[PDB]
């Protein structure tokens, strides 16, 4: 029951021009709070905040979280990059994929707190 909410993974368009412009097409985890998200869904339009996700695992940093294909619905194992967090218009949402596990979501909260210096 994906409803465009926090922790959900959506395929989004991150190209400035969009249209027939190829690539910059990435999965992303919604990290904006669900009062904002629910408002955007009620209005049919809004500005959400997402963490881009990449299939290029490479070197994993403490501000990134490993997301498993077994739970997320992604085709391959991926990595959420909290250091790439960005707000986008809901027009750039393309397709719901699934959501991160509760453990993955907890560690994404950690990674966000680290990247944004919000550890207390």
């Amino acid at each position: 029951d994906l409803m465009m909410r926090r922790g959900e993974i959506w395929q989004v368009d991150l190209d400035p021009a969009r249209g027939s412009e190829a690539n910059n097409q990435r999965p992303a985890v919604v990290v904006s709070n669900d009062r904002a998200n629910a408002t955007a869904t009620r209005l049919g339009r809004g500005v959400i905040t997402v963490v881009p996700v990449t299939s290029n695992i490479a070197k994993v940093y403490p501000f990134q979280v490993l997301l498993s294909a077994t739970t997320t619905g992604l085709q391959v194992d991926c990595k959420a990059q909290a250091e790439q967090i960005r707000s986008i218009a809901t027009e750039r949402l393309l397709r719901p994929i699934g959501r991160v596990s509760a453990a993955e979501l907890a560690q994404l909260d950690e990674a966000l707190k680290l990247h944004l210096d919000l550890w207390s």
Binding site: L14, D15, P16, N23, N24, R26, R35, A36, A38, T39, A40, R42, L43, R45, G46, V47, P52, T54, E83, Q84, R86, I88, A89, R92, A102, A103, E104, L105, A106, D109
Partner: protein, 71 residues
């Protein structure tokens, strides 16, 4: 640190929320709850803020950066 008295159903709701949200403690759950009590019109605030943002053209202004660092 305080001591509160809640019902079994209250603690069950709190634990289900903490579990679903992946929070580290019941105190964290209660912190989320209090933060929700804190702003009664937050949905409205987001609607109006987005309206200001779009009316000023700022999504068009900042949209050239939406692909930075990725791809």
């Amino acid at each position: 640190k305080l001591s509160v008295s809640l019902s079994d159903d209250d603690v069950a709701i709190l634990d289900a929320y903490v579990k679903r949200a992946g929070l580290p403690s019941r105190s964290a759950g209660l912190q989320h709850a209090i933060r929700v009590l804190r702003y009664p019109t937050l949905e409205d605030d987001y609607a109006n803020a987005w309206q200001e943002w779009s009316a000023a053209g700022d999504t068009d202004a900042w949209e050239q950066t939406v692909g930075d660092g990725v791809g």
